[PDB]
Each structure stands twice: as structure tokens, then as C-alpha cells.
Amino acid sequence: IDPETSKYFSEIANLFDSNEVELEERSVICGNALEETRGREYEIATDYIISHVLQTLLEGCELDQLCSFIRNSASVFPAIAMDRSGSHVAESALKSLATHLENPDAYSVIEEALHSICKVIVDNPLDMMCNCYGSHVLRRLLCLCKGVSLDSPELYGAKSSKALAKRLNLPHQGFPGMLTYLLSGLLSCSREDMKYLQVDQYSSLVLQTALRLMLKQDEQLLEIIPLILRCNGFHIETNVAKEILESMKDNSFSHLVEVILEVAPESLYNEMFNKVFKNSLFELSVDRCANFVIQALISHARDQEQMGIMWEELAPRFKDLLEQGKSGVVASLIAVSQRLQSHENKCCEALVGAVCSTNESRISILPRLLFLDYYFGCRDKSTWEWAPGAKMHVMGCLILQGIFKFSSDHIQPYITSLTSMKAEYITETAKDSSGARVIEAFLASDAATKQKRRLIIKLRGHFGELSLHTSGSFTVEKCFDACNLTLREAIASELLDVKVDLSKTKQGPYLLRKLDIDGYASRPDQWKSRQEAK
RNA sequence: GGAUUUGACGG
Known part of the structure; x- marks a missing residue:
């Protein structure tokens, strides 16, 4: 130059x-x-x-x-x-x-x-697929052929809370012929070359993006997935199933198989469940990489027979899984019981027993799940009660959000434990950006209204401070909505005391308008009669 | 207006 x-x-x-x-x-x-x-x-x-x-x-x-x-x-x-x-x-x-x-x-x-x-x-194509820079170009090119321009982390494929919510159960036509042509070229290598594309981080990333773009394209998925898995009716022969199973702990392949299970058509999913994963579920759940494959497998189970097989292999080991930092496996199994309407009560009770070994310790199921890592990591579990000031545990709080979507018949220990917590612990929970989600899920549950009221009353005196929190402000709203006139007035009175500071915050204006705090201050009698009419 | 698993990614 x-x-x-x-x-x-x-x-x-x-x-x-x-x-x-x-x-x-x-x-x-x-x-x-x-x-x-x-x-x-x-x-x-x-x-x-x-x-x-x-x-x-x-x-x-x-x-x-x-x-x-x-x-x-x-x-x-x-x-x-x-x-x-x-x-x-x-x-x-x-x-x-x-x-x-x-x-x-x-x-x-x-x-x-x-x-x-x-x-x-x-x-x-093969060196470009495996090349750190070329793999990015190929992902973008695949997306363009599908007709997607808007970069999505999940497509490229990073984590996102949307993918966790989907796993926990909480468009331009493009150039279809060009996508098919490009992807078929990426896949027309020998079975032995494919064996190493499986475990190369950059080619695995390319193939993940391609599979996500083929969601619901069952005739293409049934052609491309057997090529990726080297098992070219879809049937996985015994020796290939062994090789797939043996590679499942690799970091690159585990990410790929997560995506395969997310997009797999029913017949292909059932064959992988039977020939690859069945009888190995717990061993794979304790592996630092393969446990995310098990999470994907669980989340996409199809019928109640599979639910029973998963419960038998994993539920006796809920405690092990929580001890070893694998709570996402537990969360996935509990969430899919709800969707498949099977083993719901068994899953909820297995979780209690995993966290609370004695009868007397069961009243503490909520605090221990809110602080799952502190409780399982503590010196003496018989005296642990709380983690003052600590950030609450994300997956434990997501488990609890899923718990409170069950019928109240299945979760009486959780409702009793949550509504029994003393005022200071409940307010600390509401002030936590994960704990507040647990309270809101309980407020939306079909627990009894008296049980909801009991918890809301123990937040009295703290609604002002909560409204100033970005997360806590949603909790004030949902408490207000679930209250009678008396407690609505108490909440409105508390926000009035902090109205200056609250209007400064991002959520304040919306909170002040939705609860009509100005109208409560200026015309309290009219505010009350409009509220009592709701 | 809200936290987001325990294992990857660029001149």
C-alpha cells in the first residue's frame, strides 16, 4: 500500500x-x-x-x-x-x-x-468455519440469508434472560434457497471432519447459529441434524450414540447439543432422549458443561413417560445437584413438570426435602432458597438463618418464581414459609431485585387472599423506601393492586411522604400517576371512592 | 421503569 x-x-x-x-x-x-x-x-x-x-x-x-x-x-x-x-x-x-x-x-x-x-x-469452508474472525462473518451471513438484520445475542449465540425465561417457561422471507445452499456447503465434509467441527469452538458457534435460524423448518432440521451428529427414519445406531454421549462434556459440543435439543422435531428429540441421554442423566448433570445440555433436554421433554424417567434419575439427587452448583437442572425439571402437568407435587416435595432435611427445618425453605449459595456454602447448616445484606440467589429466586405458578395444593410448605417470614426478612426480600420477583409471583399465585394480605401487611412502613427502588416500585404497584381500600390508603400515605424524592426517579412519575398520589393528597375522599370502586 | 445459571468468542 x-x-x-x-x-x-x-x-x-x-x-x-x-x-x-x-x-x-x-x-x-x-x-x-x-x-x-x-x-x-x-x-x-x-x-x-x-x-x-x-x-x-x-x-x-x-x-x-x-x-x-x-x-x-x-x-x-x-x-x-x-x-x-x-x-x-x-x-x-x-x-x-x-x-x-x-x-x-x-x-x-x-x-x-x-x-x-x-x-x-x-x-x-472448513478453515473459515473454525477461524475466530471468519466464524463471525459466517454467522452474520447465515442471519442475512434468513432475512434477519437485527443483531440478536441469542442468534450469535450469547446468553440472555429471554433464553433463560424460555428454558424455565417464564419476518422478512429472506433468501431460503441461499440459506439452504450455504448451510449444505458447510455440512458436506467427511464424518471424521464433522467429528472435529463438533468440538471446535468457532465451527460449533457457526452451526449453532444455523440451527437457530432453521427453527420450525422440520424437513431441513431432519436433514441437517443427522449430518451434524454423524448418524446419517432418523435412527442413532449404538456406536454413534456412544460417541455422541462421550463428547457431551466438551465445552464446544455441549453448546451445540443445547441448540440441537431446542430445535429438534419430536421424532428426533425422542430418539436422542432414548439412545443418548437416558440412564446418564445424573452423570451429565454434575458435569460443568453437560449439565446445560441436560437443562435443554429437560426443558424440551415431550410427554409424561419422559417426565417419569427424568424424575427417577434426578429427583433422588436434588440435594447433590444443589450442593454442587447445578440448581439450573433442578429449576428446569420443576418448570417442565408444570408444563407437562406431571410429577408436579413430587417435584415440589423433592425440592423441600433436598433443602430441609429435618421436619423442623422445613419452615425455612424460603430463606434457604433465596440465599441458596450462602446456605449450601455455610460452615454449620443447623444454625444458618439468613445472609444479612447479601444479594439474593438468581436461580433460587427463579425456582421460587416457578414454584408460585403451581396450584396452591402442591406448594403449601412454600406459601406457609413465605408468609411466616418476619417483617424485616420480607422487606429485605422486597428490596432485592431477585427477591422482589418471588414476592410478586406469590401475589399472582392462587394462594389465599388472607395469606397475601398477611404478607403485604408486614411491608407496612416500607412502601416509601420500596417505591424509590427501581425493582421495588413494581412490588409497590402489585401490592397496591392486591389490597383493599384500607391498605391502599396506607400505601398511598407512605408514597406521599417521599413524593419529592420519588418524582426524581425513573419509575416515580408512572407510580405517582397509577396510584393517583396527587389526588389522594388533594381530594382524599374522592380518591377513596374511586379506589373502593376497583 | 426491574435481577438473569455454573461452562466459550475479535482489529
């Missing part, structure tokens, strides 16, 4: 840093500058400085010039995509294409640009 080329692209960049140029002129300049990359796309896109300018040009230009750049760079696209800088240039080209998805006039021009890219990739 000569200094004339450097100066040219740097001067373009400075020209955009100044806003002397209007939007229409800018996109024309972006297109002219792309022409200066012809015949040296690789050198410019992989330059550690100019790559950034090229990103700006690709996202600022119009569709025709973008497609011309993609067409002219296609023969070097894999090398660009596998470069530490060039990969961001490649992804900027994809993001820029994605901005035209909503334009129906753009369909065939986009499809042709995707074809030129997919064809060079399919010709030689």
Missing part, C-alpha cells in the same frame, strides 16, 4: 469527520471511493488503518456500489473474512446489504451478491 493510497482514503475519512457534506453527496463519494479499491480489495480491507475507512464507505454507499464491491471482492472474500481487520470490513458489507432487505426492488440484486459470496465459501 503506497502513500498515495493511504492519503486518498485518509482524506476521504477526514472529509466525513467534517460535516461540510450532505447525506446525498456523502453516499456518492462513498461509492466513488469504493471504485479505488478495485484490484486490491484484499490489501485495502486487511490494512490495519484503512480497513476502518472501508467500513465507513461500505455502510455509507448505495446498493449498486455495494454489490459491485462484493462482486469484485468475491474471489478474496474468505481471506478478507478470516483477517483480524478484514473480517469487520466483510461484516460491514453484510450489515450494509441488510439495510436494503425491506426494499422489494432490491431482492434480486441482494440475492446475486449473496450468491457470489456463498459460492466462494462453499468451495472451501
Whole structure:
């Protein structure tokens, strides 16, 4: 790269840093500058400085010039995509294409640009799939072929609370033929090559994204999943099942199998359950990686016979699982009993017995689950009662949120334990961003109204402080909604005392309006008669 | 306007 080329692209960049140029002129300049990359796309896109300018040009230009750049760079696209800088240039080209998805006039021009890219990739895909940078480019490209532009953490595939909520039970048409063509190229390697794509972090990530994009496309899922699992009616022979089972503790493969189980059609799921997982459930649940596969398996069980097999292998070991930091397995099994309507009472009672070994300790089931890690990690479990000031346990509180969705017939120990907690522990729970969710789930349960009222009364004197919390303010709302006139007035009176500070907060204005705190202060008789009418 | 599992990811 000569200094004339450097100066040219740097001067373009400075020209955009100044806003002397209007939007229409800018996109024309972006297109002219792309022409200066012809015949040296690789050198410019992989330059550690100019790559950034090229990103700006690709996202600022119009569709025709973008497609011309993609067409002219296609023969070097894999090398660009596998470069530490060039990969961001490649992804900027994809993001820029994605901005035209909503334009129906753009369909065939986009499809042709995707074809030129997919064809060079399919010709030689395996090192790109395993490449730290190339794997990102491929994920984005797969998403674009599906027609999704909006980056989703889950698609790429990070954790998200939405995926946890889905696991715990709490669109543009795209270019379907291009997605199928690209993915089939990624999968047409030998069974032995596939065995190592399974355990390579970057190819596993590519295949995870592809499987998520194929959700509900059962005829494609039934073709692609047997290729990934090397077991090409869907049947897993005994020796292949052994190899799948033996790789389940690998960090890369375990993430892949989580996604397989999430998208698997019924027949394919049932075969994996029977041939791979059955009789190994507890061993896999104690492994630092495979236990997340078991969580996915549990969450997607299909019928009551499977629920019975899962309960027999795992419920006797609820205590072990909680002791060893595997509470998500327990949470998944409890949640799916609720969905499959099977073993509900057995799951709730097994959880109590796992946490409370003696009859007398059962009154403490709520505190111990709220602080699950402190209780199981403490020096002397016979004297532990609380963890003053500590942040409550996320998965323990999610378990409790699921508990309070059962029929009250199944969870009497939990209702009694929660409503028995003394005022200071209940207020501490309400002030916790996880504990507040437990209280709200109880308030929404079919526990008796007198039991709800008993708990709400023990929050009296603290509604003002709670309203100032971002999380606690929702709890004030839901207490208020569940109250009679007398307690609504008490809550309204407490918010009145902190009305100045409360209006400063993000939630304050909405809380003050929903409870009509101004009307209570100014016309209390009219406020009460409107409240008593609700 | 709200916490988000115990095991991965970039010039």
C-alpha cells in the first residue's frame, strides 16, 4: 500500500469527520471511493488503518456500489473474512446489504451478491468455519440469508434472560434457497471432519447459529441434524450414540447439543432422549458443561413417560445437584413438570426435602432458597438463618418464581414459609431485585387472599423506601393492586411522604400517576371512592 | 421503569 493510497482514503475519512457534506453527496463519494479499491480489495480491507475507512464507505454507499464491491471482492472474500481487520470490513458489507432487505426492488440484486459470496465459501469452508474472525462473518451471513438484520445475542449465540425465561417457561422471507445452499456447503465434509467441527469452538458457534435460524423448518432440521451428529427414519445406531454421549462434556459440543435439543422435531428429540441421554442423566448433570445440555433436554421433554424417567434419575439427587452448583437442572425439571402437568407435587416435595432435611427445618425453605449459595456454602447448616445484606440467589429466586405458578395444593410448605417470614426478612426480600420477583409471583399465585394480605401487611412502613427502588416500585404497584381500600390508603400515605424524592426517579412519575398520589393528597375522599370502586 | 445459571468468542 503506497502513500498515495493511504492519503486518498485518509482524506476521504477526514472529509466525513467534517460535516461540510450532505447525506446525498456523502453516499456518492462513498461509492466513488469504493471504485479505488478495485484490484486490491484484499490489501485495502486487511490494512490495519484503512480497513476502518472501508467500513465507513461500505455502510455509507448505495446498493449498486455495494454489490459491485462484493462482486469484485468475491474471489478474496474468505481471506478478507478470516483477517483480524478484514473480517469487520466483510461484516460491514453484510450489515450494509441488510439495510436494503425491506426494499422489494432490491431482492434480486441482494440475492446475486449473496450468491457470489456463498459460492466462494462453499468451495472451501472448513478453515473459515473454525477461524475466530471468519466464524463471525459466517454467522452474520447465515442471519442475512434468513432475512434477519437485527443483531440478536441469542442468534450469535450469547446468553440472555429471554433464553433463560424460555428454558424455565417464564419476518422478512429472506433468501431460503441461499440459506439452504450455504448451510449444505458447510455440512458436506467427511464424518471424521464433522467429528472435529463438533468440538471446535468457532465451527460449533457457526452451526449453532444455523440451527437457530432453521427453527420450525422440520424437513431441513431432519436433514441437517443427522449430518451434524454423524448418524446419517432418523435412527442413532449404538456406536454413534456412544460417541455422541462421550463428547457431551466438551465445552464446544455441549453448546451445540443445547441448540440441537431446542430445535429438534419430536421424532428426533425422542430418539436422542432414548439412545443418548437416558440412564446418564445424573452423570451429565454434575458435569460443568453437560449439565446445560441436560437443562435443554429437560426443558424440551415431550410427554409424561419422559417426565417419569427424568424424575427417577434426578429427583433422588436434588440435594447433590444443589450442593454442587447445578440448581439450573433442578429449576428446569420443576418448570417442565408444570408444563407437562406431571410429577408436579413430587417435584415440589423433592425440592423441600433436598433443602430441609429435618421436619423442623422445613419452615425455612424460603430463606434457604433465596440465599441458596450462602446456605449450601455455610460452615454449620443447623444454625444458618439468613445472609444479612447479601444479594439474593438468581436461580433460587427463579425456582421460587416457578414454584408460585403451581396450584396452591402442591406448594403449601412454600406459601406457609413465605408468609411466616418476619417483617424485616420480607422487606429485605422486597428490596432485592431477585427477591422482589418471588414476592410478586406469590401475589399472582392462587394462594389465599388472607395469606397475601398477611404478607403485604408486614411491608407496612416500607412502601416509601420500596417505591424509590427501581425493582421495588413494581412490588409497590402489585401490592397496591392486591389490597383493599384500607391498605391502599396506607400505601398511598407512605408514597406521599417521599413524593419529592420519588418524582426524581425513573419509575416515580408512572407510580405517582397509577396510584393517583396527587389526588389522594388533594381530594382524599374522592380518591377513596374511586379506589373502593376497583 | 426491574435481577438473569455454573461452562466459550475479535482489529
